[PDB]
Amino acid sequence: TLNGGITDMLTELANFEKNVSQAIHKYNAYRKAASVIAKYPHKIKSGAEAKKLPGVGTKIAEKIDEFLATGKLRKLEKIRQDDTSSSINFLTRVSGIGPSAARKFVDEGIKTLEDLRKNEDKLNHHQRIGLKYFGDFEKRIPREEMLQMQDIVLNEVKKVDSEYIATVCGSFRRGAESSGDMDVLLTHPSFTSESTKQPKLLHQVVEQLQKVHFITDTLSKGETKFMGVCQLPSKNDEKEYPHRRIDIRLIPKDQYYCGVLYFTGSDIFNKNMRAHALEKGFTINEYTIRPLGVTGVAGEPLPVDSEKDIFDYIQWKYREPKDRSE
DNA sequence: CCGACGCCGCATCAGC
DNA sequence: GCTGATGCGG
DNA sequence: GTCGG
Ligand SMILES: Nc1ccn([C@H]2C[C@H](O)[C@@H](COP(=O)(O)CP(=O)(O)OP(=O)(O)O)O2)c(=O)n1
Ligand SMILES: [Cl-]
Ligand SMILES: [Cl-]
Ligand SMILES: [Cl-]
Ligand SMILES: [Cl-]
Ligand SMILES: [Mg+2]
Ligand SMILES: [Mg+2]
Ligand code: NA
Ligand code: NA
Numbered sequence: 001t002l003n004g005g006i007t008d009m010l011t012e013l014a015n016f017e018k019n020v021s022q023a024i025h026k027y028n029a030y031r032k033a034a035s036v037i038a039k040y041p042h043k044i045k046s047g048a049e050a051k052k053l054p055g056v057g058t059k060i061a062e063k064i065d066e067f068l069a070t071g072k073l074r075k076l077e078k079i080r081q082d083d084t085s086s087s088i089n090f091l092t093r094v095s096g097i098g099p100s101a102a103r104k105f106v107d108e109g110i111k112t113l114e115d116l117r118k119n120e121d122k123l124n125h126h127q128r129i130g131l132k133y134f135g136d137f138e139k140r141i142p143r144e145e146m147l148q149m150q151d152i153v154l155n156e157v158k159k160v161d162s163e164y165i166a167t168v169c170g171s172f173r174r175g176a177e178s179s180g181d182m183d184v185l186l187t188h189p190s191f192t193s194e195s196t197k198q199p200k201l202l203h204q205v206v207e208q209l210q211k212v213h214f215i216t217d218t219l220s221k222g223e224t225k226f227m228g229v230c231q232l233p234s235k236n237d238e239k240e241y242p243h244r245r246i247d248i249r250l251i252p253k254d255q256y257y258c259g260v261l262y263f264t265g266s267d268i269f270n271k272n273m274r275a276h277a278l279e280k281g282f283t284i285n286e287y288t289i290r291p292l293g294v295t296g297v298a299g300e301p302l303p304v305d306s307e308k309d310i311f312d313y314i315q316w317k318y319r320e321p322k323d324r325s326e
Numbered sequence: 327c328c329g330a331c332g333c334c335g336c337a338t339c340a341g342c
Numbered sequence: 343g344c345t346g347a348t349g350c351g352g
Numbered sequence: 353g354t355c356g357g
Binding site: 088095096097098100126132170181218219220225227247249262263265267270286 | 348349350351352
């Protein structure tokens with residue numbers, strides 16, 4: 001937190017541009033600046049010093065100078081004062097309300113938590129769940145609770161079929177001391193890039209977790225991705241744990257390493273690695289790394305037997321998950 | 327100066 | 343129904 | 353908003 005004041009400023013700017021301006025590239029520009037400053041190992045003393053970093057340009061350098069001189073940014077002070085912007089920013093904090101729905105709601109005069117409750121009939125299913133658990137979804141998950149959740153998921157998956165492999169990814173696999181949610185990568189030998197020899201592979205796992213009352217609600221569910229809600233069991237007389245977001249990704253077993261690279265993140269790390277891949281003539285998704293032809297169309301998948309193989313193709317030194325939290 | 331900015335699953339809607 | 347575009351979030 | 357060519 002050497003530069004926490006500056007990085008906070010940039011994150012609030014990114015959030016404004018995404019939620020209010022609906023300018024996604026400015027959102028990513030600010031987040032990239034925040035990320036490169038967050039790993040800068042000195043306490044930044046000037047905008048000129050910051051502008052040396054890749055992704056900090058003239059405009060952000062000027063803002064950093066204003067912030068360093070005064071402790072504030074007038075642009076943000078004005079934004080915090082604006083009723084419509086503040087209302088749109090707030091509504092997007094509900095899971096399932098994005099910038100478009102938030103502005104639509106605010107236009108209809110729906111601007112507060114109380115307004116959302118009174119107008120629950122105007123919400124789709126995802127948004128209704130996000131409003132129901134708004135408070136809980138604001139709380140972090142201590143790693144100690146992540147470890148308990150991991151134990152339940154891995155044991156329940158094993159009971160369905162001992163040939164499943166479940167891997168907790170996301171910030172947890174990066175070693176974080178707390179997480180916003182739980183991300184579970186799932187494989188089964190019957191599901192590969194070549195064939196699907198069994199149906200309902202994800203369904204069966206979801207059903208087992210619902211059966212033991214771990215999964216409590218479903219936000220979305222398809223053949224390979226589940227997004228929903230779970231809760232640790234509590235003891236007699238003890239307050240219930242907060243409800244938590246969980247999302248599960250079933251990945252073809254022969255594409256495990258591309259999948260665990262993707263699901264480990266961070267999101268900014270994935271964007272930077274995939275951008276570097278492109279510069280090196282490759283494209284990376286959660287399934288494959290493919291070379292780009294002379295016209296730039298993806299070729300055939302390249303052999304991959306470890307995460308490190310993917311780094312080697314694009315000429316990056318390997319980075320352990322804990323060093324991927326960008 | 328300017329185009330390019332990672333890549334994709336699921337829910338929902340419009341148009342047919 | 344299906345396809346394609348869009349919103350949202352992983 | 354930033355940057356590479
Ligand atoms: N825009 C995105 C978003 C996510 N991903 C990948 C990388 C991320 O780590 C994983 C889980 O996302 P999550 O949304 O769960 C974020 P995570 O890194 O797990 O941190 P927490 O806030 O503690 O959950 O999904 C991506 O590639 N592109
Ligand atoms: Cl933009
Ligand atoms: Cl401020
Ligand atoms: Cl792979
Ligand atoms: Cl692919
Ligand atoms: Mg996560
Ligand atoms: Mg997640
Ligand atoms: Na720079
Ligand atoms: Na939201």
